[PDB]
Write a protein that binds this ligand. Structure first.
Ligand SMILES: C=C(C)[C@H]1CC[N@@H+]2CCC[C@H](C)[C@@]2(C)C1
Ligand SMILES: C=C(C)[C@H]1CC[N@@H+]2CCC[C@H](C)[C@@]2(C)C1
Ligand SMILES: [Mg+2]
Ligand SMILES: [Mg+2]
Ligand SMILES: [Mg+2]
Ligand SMILES: [Mg+2]
Ligand SMILES: [Mg+2]
Ligand SMILES: [Mg+2]
Lengths: 304, 304
């Protein structure tokens, strides 16, 4: 699969090697893997590597929090595939009060205490910015088991839903936390078109590379949790082409979204609305798009 | 607009010039054009040229019938843009029994006697093959004013509907007629998937090139008859990109349909199911696709 040209230059956080060792090591100590094969597969994924590609301008003393959060979320994303919507929702809802810190974790259950300790540590570091990630995470978690996944969707409807399931908002708040980048409500409201555009790119680039993994899952895992929900399948169906053909077409659309990002950024600046905070922010989103692509292309999570 | 690479090479009927003069000449004599500007615009379109590009292997003494039929359908297609759906339906429905020869035309009304005389001349030449064009034409006519045009559609629903509005079936029956190419019902059932795929290519290539014309029409003619119904707008809205962006993506999808045509034909031959008749037929479909594209990218109908 030959990606169409992009003008985006992906960047990776400079501390990626040390932070990946730290965070992978933490999960290898605490998380419950079913066997050694699974432990190796976990390390192969490079969950801290994608985090460092997503947030290359994260502050050095903050990048690890982001790595931990995305790692645990990846792990849960995989667990949900073996559950019904009802079971998955129950699993996720239990972690919400724990994430807030309202409820103590069962220390015999790694997901509970990992989640609890992580969020406590983030609030200890920067309470205001950590709290601003909570609702975006819960919105993502609830989308994961939304019944809409069991209903046919068109492309537009899918992308509207997928903005939640792909965790666009959580990634934005996490990026801001990791960079210590504070924005006003007016600044935030100002870039909503830019956000919505960026989420389609993240979503579809992921869909393109994760399709084979997810097709297999739809055949082998739970009839609800493993359900095939992806732009690749949707376009293949609507246009009556193969999944591989749909990937090639979707990749061209991703590049059109890249062009639109540049246009929207130019226009924000042109109408005198680009603050220094907003400039750092929209550049931040570009790294998310190019980083997501670079990792997705190379990660063993999708290639094997 | 740079079309991506294609391996389909167009071909034009050898008698294109003389048949064009003949058929243009007939319509200039009989059709009620409003003024000299419209007469010139009619000749500028090259309706017999597109017909000769669609059916380059038509029999020398049948190609003119196809030019006449497509020419009158083009003229009516344009008239409908200034009517409500209801008016358009009444207009087309009048012509249906006349096309059958069941009702005599009012000889003071050019569209009626042109339609009557044409179909009578086709039945005189080859009755069985002429009759096989009737219902496909009527299916297309009824799609033209179907209120589904004014209701939301996704890409898949559009392509399904547009198969009728683009006249895929009538073009196929007309192609066979013009070539004297008789296929059995079983043979036709074998290539149904091939037909469906070819329809999407004809549709979207036309949509891409005729978009500027249709956009202008939507803003200036009847709000129903001139309504913008096209994959360019549908994809632009589904993806939230410009019309120009949608065209680029759609063009790549057209090449995917070309690949699929080649795969389906190869499979048909491999299974020992490609009769000599079917071989001629599928090659004929390829000419429609490439001829449609060559004319669309060059006709003054779309560029001015
Ligand atoms: C940061 C990414 C590479 C996204 C890819 C898909 N995963 C699924 C698990 C939960 C994450 C938020 C994410 C959507 C992240
Ligand atoms: C044969 C073609 C080039 C198609 C182009 C669009 N026109 C519009 C008028 C009615 C025709 C059937 C057609 C769809 C033919
Ligand atoms: Mg997943
Ligand atoms: Mg998921
Ligand atoms: Mg995926
Ligand atoms: Mg038209
Ligand atoms: Mg039309
Ligand atoms: Mg058109």
């Amino acid at each position: 699969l030959e990606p169409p040209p992009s003008t985006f230059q992906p960047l990776c956080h400079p501390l990626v090697e040390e932070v990946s060792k730290e965070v992978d090591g933490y999960f290898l100590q605490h998380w419950n893997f079913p066997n050694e094969k699974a432990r190796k597969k976990f390390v192969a994924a490079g969950f801290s590597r994608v985090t460092c590609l997503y947030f290359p301008k994260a502050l050095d003393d903050r990048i690890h929090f982001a790595c931990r959060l995305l790692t645990v979320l990846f792990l849960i994303d995989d667990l949900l595939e073996y559950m019904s919507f009802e079971e998955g929702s129950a699993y996720n809802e239990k972690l919400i009060p724990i994430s807030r810190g309202d409820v103590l974790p069962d220390r015999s259950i790694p997901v509970e205490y990992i989640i609890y300790d992580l969020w406590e540590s983030m609030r200890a570091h920067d309470r205001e910015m950590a709290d601003e990630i909570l609702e975006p995470v819960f919105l993502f978690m609830r989308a994961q088991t939304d019944r809409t996944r069991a209903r046919p969707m068109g492309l537009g409807g899918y992308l509207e839903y997928r903005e939640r399931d792909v965790g666009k908002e959580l990634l934005a708040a996490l990026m801001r936390f990791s960079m210590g980048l504070k924005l006003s409500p007016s600044e935030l409201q100002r870039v909503r078109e830019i956000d919505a555009n960026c989420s389609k790119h993240l979503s579809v680039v992921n869909d393109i590379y994760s399709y084979e993994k997810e097709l297999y899952t739809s055949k082998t895992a739970h009839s609800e949790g493993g359900i095939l929900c992806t732009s690749v399948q949707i376009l293949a169906q609507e246009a009556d082409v193969t999944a591989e053909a749909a990937k090639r077409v979707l990749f061209v659309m991703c590049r059109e979204w890249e062009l639109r990002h540049q246009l929207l950024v130019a226009r924000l600046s042109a109408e005198g609305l680009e603050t220094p905070g907003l400039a750092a922010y929209v550049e931040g989103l570009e790294y998310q798009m190019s980083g997501n692509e670079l990792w997705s292309q190379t990660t063993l999570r999708y290639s094997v």
